[PDB]
Design a protein around this ligand. Structure first.
Ligand SMILES: COc1c(NC(=O)N2CCC[C@H](C(N)=O)C2)cccc1C(F)(F)F
Ligand SMILES: [Zn+2]
Length: 139
């Protein structure tokens, strides 16, 4: 679990969005596993606007932060799950690191701000949904 809170927006994994997220929907994209909902309160977070390929993520299944080197946002094949058929997920960045399904939502940050959230993983890999291209989150 986990979310990004920037301005009047809440960014979550689309597959973990609640009834209230859908009732306050701003934008969603199944191909990216992202959903953004509106908030009444002003959020705590800053979005990175950079091309960093290293950073630190929070791993809830270890209660620890880990440093990672990750690939540039790209189209990656993701096996079928209960949430989605087998498909290519776009804007996904992979890294070697521990992750379990419940780790989705953990934030990846670099020195500039929030980069993205945990969205996929397995076999010593962790995948992050990028949010740095979503310039409208800042206005
Ligand atoms: C494949 O199972 C996982 C997952 N689950 C997912 O990646 N997915 C399930 C949720 C939607 C994701 C997506 N964005 O489509 C895919 C995450 C971390 C670790 C593992 C594990 F180690 F068990 F293999
Ligand atoms: Zn950066």
């Amino acid at each position: 679990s986990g979310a990004i809170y920037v301005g009047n927006y809440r960014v979550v994994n689309r597959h973990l969005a609640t009834h209230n997220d859908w009732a306050n929907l701003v934008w969603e994209d199944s191909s990216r596993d992202l959903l953004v909902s509106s908030t009444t309160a002003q959020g705590c977070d800053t979005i990175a606007r950079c091309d960093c390929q290293t950073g630190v993520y929070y791993c809830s299944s270890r209660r620890k932060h880990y440093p990672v080197s990750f690939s540039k946002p790209s189209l990656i094949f993701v096996e079928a799950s209960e949430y989605y058929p087998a498909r290519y997920q776009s804007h996904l960045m992979l890294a070697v690191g521990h992750s379990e399904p419940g780790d989705c939502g953990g934030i990846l940050r670099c020195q500039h701000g929030v980069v993205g959230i945990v969205s996929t993983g397995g076999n010593g890999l962790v995948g992050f949904a990028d949010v740095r291209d979503l310039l409208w989150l800042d206005e």
